[PDB]
């Protein structure tokens, strides 16, 4: 049909100007290859962690704790303390 | 039975005016009272258009249908019983006129404007509906060719919808 046609034809030449060419826009001021294309490309980022999702910050899993292998000083004092419990069992 | 049913509202005096006088002949003898006296109508601005109000009395509707019907024969036939029994039945029935004017065609005329993406106002008057239009179209084409717009096609409408809601 000819208004289907010439539909088609002014939709996807000028559909070729705003994405299948690198014509941009004439009618709108502003290209969305220099807006979107890189630094909208950051607002998945600005979103995310900046720098640091992608990047997902190096954080090693650390150590537990522990008595520091310290039964010349430890040992004596938690006898001592379990038998003073003791004395109300 | 009428050739279809008009759904009344204030269709039924008219619908029961061609049934009366299709019992009769009284087709073009029907629609020629009723022209004239609606022609009699629009040549009176006043007096004939006031006169068309709910405000007028018994009395004076039975007088002004009297009236206008004094215009020599030109209310000739059941259209006089007709217009006096509205006289106090309902005041208003230039609709009625065109309604009746609706039958007749219904009975001899028939065809109104097919439109479908054309906005013409174009007539085929015959029976059939299988031959005729496709002339007539044609014709209404090549031919005046007026105001038809409908704008654009409503596809414009229908294909911008659909590519715009994913």
């Not at chain 1, 910050?57 to 379990?82: F, N, Q, R, Y």
């Given at each position: 049909?000819?208004?289907?046609?010439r539909?088609?034809?002014d939709?996807?030449l000028?559909?070729?100007?705003?994405?299948?060419?690198e014509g941009?826009v004439?009618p709108?001021?502003?290209?969305?290859?220099?807006?979107?294309?890189?630094?909208?490309?950051?607002?998945?980022?600005?979103?995310?962690?900046?720098?640091?999702?992608?990047?997902?910050?190096?954080?090693?899993?650390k150590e537990?704790?522990?008595g520091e292998?310290?039964?010349?000083?430890?040992?004596?004092?938690?006898l001592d303390?379990?038998?003073?419990?003791?004395?109300?069992? | 039975?009428?050739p279809?049913?008009?759904?009344?509202?204030?269709?039924?005096?008219?619908?029961?005016?061609?049934?009366?006088?299709?019992?009769?002949?009284?087709?073009?003898?029907?629609?020629?009272?009723?022209?004239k006296?609606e022609?009699?109508?629009?040549?009176?601005?006043k007096?004939?258009?006031?006169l068309?109000?709910?405000?007028?009395?018994?009395?004076?509707?039975?007088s002004?249908?009297?009236?206008?019907?004094?215009?020599?024969k030109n209310?000739?036939?059941?259209?006089?019983?007709?217009?006096?029994?509205?006289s106090?039945?309902?005041r208003?029935?230039?609709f009625?006129k065109?309604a009746s004017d609706?039958g007749?065609?219904n009975?001899?005329h028939?065809?109104?404007?097919?439109?479908?993406?054309?906005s013409?106002?174009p007539?085929?008057?015959?029976?059939?509906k299988?031959?005729?239009?496709?002339?007539?179209?044609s014709?209404?084409?090549?031919?005046?060719?007026?105001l038809?717009?409908?704008?654009?096609?409503?596809?414009?409408?229908?294909?911008?919808?659909?590519?715009?809601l994913?």
């Amino acid at each position: 049909q000819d208004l289907y046609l010439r539909e088609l034809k002014d939709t996807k030449l000028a559909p070729s100007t705003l994405q299948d060419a690198e014509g941009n826009v004439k009618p709108w001021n502003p290209p969305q290859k220099p807006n979107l294309p890189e630094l909208e490309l950051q607002g998945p980022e600005a979103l995310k962690a900046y720098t640091e999702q992608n990047v997902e910050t190096a954080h090693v899993a650390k150590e537990s704790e522990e008595g520091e292998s310290e039964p010349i000083e430890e040992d004596w004092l938690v006898l001592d303390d379990a038998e003073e419990t003791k004395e109300s069992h | 039975p009428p050739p279809v049913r008009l759904f009344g509202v204030e269709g039924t005096y008219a619908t029961a005016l061609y049934q009366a006088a299709a019992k009769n002949s009284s087709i073009d003898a029907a629609f020629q009272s009723l022209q004239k006296v609606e022609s009699t109508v629009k040549k009176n601005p006043k007096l004939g258009h006031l006169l068309l109000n709910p405000a007028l009395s018994l009395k004076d509707r039975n007088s002004v249908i009297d009236a206008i019907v004094e215009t020599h024969k030109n209310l000739d036939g059941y259209v006089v019983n007709l217009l006096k029994v509205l006289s106090e039945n309902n005041r208003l029935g230039c609709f009625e006129k065109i309604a009746s004017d609706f039958g007749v065609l219904n009975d001899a005329h028939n065809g109104l404007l097919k439109g479908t993406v054309t906005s013409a106002e174009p007539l085929d008057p015959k029976s059939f509906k299988r031959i005729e239009k496709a002339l007539s179209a044609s014709k209404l084409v090549g031919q005046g060719k007026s105001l038809k717009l409908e704008n654009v096609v409503k596809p414009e409408i229908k294909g911008g919808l659909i590519v715009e809601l994913g």
